[PDB]
Amino acid sequence: IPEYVDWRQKGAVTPVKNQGSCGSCWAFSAVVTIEGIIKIRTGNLNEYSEQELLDCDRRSYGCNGGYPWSALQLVAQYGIHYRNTYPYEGVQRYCRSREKGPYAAKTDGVRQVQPYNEGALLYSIANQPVSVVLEAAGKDFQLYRGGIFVGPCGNKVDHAVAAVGYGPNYILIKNSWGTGWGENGYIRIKRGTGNSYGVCGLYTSSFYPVKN
């Protein structure tokens, strides 16, 4: 795999979103991997509905948090609508997939990256954007304004984001806190420290959709 990967330069990443007060990061995370894999397989970049996952993933807890892998299984099992037809409201409502007509896209499954393995994650990122989790509650992460983030942070992961790239000394993360946070909405997190958790627990739980 190359020294540098940036799925934004291959046009597989849509604009940075803001999840708002809602703890819907798990849905935003899952969506950017869906947006990535559909662009990689069909050449078409579309935005898909975080709100639909928010409303429809019964295993997750809406704005109280949830599981990227459950959201990803939902899209594998049923499908997902365009963001335009099912826009983000920042509040869990009822599942309205059936009122929105046919699904815009479907995936074929979900795989977990082998946990606590930096190489395994990098290999997956070289293939497609990956849903990863990290500890975002620390003030240093929240006040991140740019550069390669090394912490401080622990491993109490609490926030789902998407890895969309990497370089020799970092992994490139799309956050869902709007374009004003970090590097126009992104954070580069140090890799290669030999801590098997990853910086801020980044290697704890990583998932990507499969599309044949």
Q: Is 93 exposed, middle or buried (0-12, 13-18, 19+ CB in 10 A)?
A: exposed
Catalytic residue among 56, 153, 175, 200: 175
**At which residue do the structure tokens 């006040």 appear?**
143
- C-alpha to C-alpha distance for 172 and 155, rounded to whole angstroms: 18
Q: Resolution of this PDB entry, in A?
A: 1.8
Indicate which CATH number applies to the domain containing 135: 3.90.70.10
**Binding-site residues from annotation:** 25
Binding residues for E64: 25
Q: Pick the catalytic residue: 56, 81, 159, 200? A: 159
46: annotated active-site residue: no
Q: How many domains does the chain have?
A: 1
> In the annotation, is 63 catalytic?
no
* Torsion of the alpha carbons at 10, 15, 19 and 25, rounded to the nearest 10: 0
Cβ(130)–Cβ(117) below 8 Å? no
Structural domain of 194: 1-212
Give every CB contact of residue 35 below 8 A, 6+ residues apart in sequence: 12, 13, 14, 45, 46, 47, 48, 129
CB atoms within 10 A of CB 194: 6
11 contacts 39 by C-beta, under 8 angstroms: yes
Annotated catalytic residue 159:
yes
Q: Look up residue 133 and give its amino acid.
A: V
